[PDB]
Design a binder for this molecule. Sequence first.
Ligand SMILES: CC(=O)O[C@@H]1[C@H](O)[C@@H](O)O[C@H](COS(N)(=O)=O)[C@H]1OC(C)=O
Ligand SMILES: [Zn+2]
Length: 257
Amino acid sequence: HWGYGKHNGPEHWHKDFPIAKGERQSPVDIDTHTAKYDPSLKPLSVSYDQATSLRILNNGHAFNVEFDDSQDKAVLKGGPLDGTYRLIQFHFHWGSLDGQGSEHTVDKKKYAAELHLVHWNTKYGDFGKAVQQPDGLAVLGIFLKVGSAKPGLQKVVDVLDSIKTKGKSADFTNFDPRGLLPESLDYWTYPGSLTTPPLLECVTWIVLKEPISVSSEQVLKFRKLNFNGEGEPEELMVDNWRPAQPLKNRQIKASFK
Ligand SMILES: CC(=O)O[C@@H]1[C@H](O)[C@@H](O)O[C@H](COS(N)(=O)=O)[C@H]1OC(C)=O
Ligand SMILES: [Zn+2]
């Protein structure tokens, strides 16, 4: 099926997933000088105090830190969002080199990686139904640049050795996603899609202006993961990012001037 290699990569997805060429695909390039400050946006509210992480899994495309979303334990509200969006998982996209890896770009600039915290609109009862709605999901995107270490990320980095290959998973309780946030919640926002198949156009993207720094040693460990299952020839997990798509009939709004 789909992947990021030369033969199954994003340039091919449209064949199985025609929506790949759709009205509101992600990611996109964020042109800081075309984005419009929107004074009517409410402050963004990240409420990750009761967050309950459960497990980390290598699914052959990325690794997912999964959260207990049977209740409003960790939610996202405010900003451009209507209602309550519940945290289900976070994951990353990254490159084979520090100059690439992010999905969204800022004035065409690629970051070394991009963290995605995925939430679903609780008005729809479950994730499956929410992906079928134009306001079904809210993904909080955070850029990673290489520099000094992010201590809050290190717990994640150390467990990757135990989920090297596709299908593997490890326990991952008591992780606090608040340690992954930058100091500022200034953001850009636009309507978009999942960035992997099925590429459903159900996402309100919230992309933070301020990157977090991670060390080269931290990102290197991301790059030791495998796309392949155990006992197969090694395909390093790198460059699992979709390039920017056309903005078309959309506007990006900023929470700041
Ligand atoms: C459970 C799972 O497979 O998660 C996917 C995975 O984390 C990652 O490859 O990105 C996808 C792309 O989503 S992302 N980039 O839009 O936020 C995720 O897909 C979805 C449906 O959550
Ligand atoms: Zn993602």
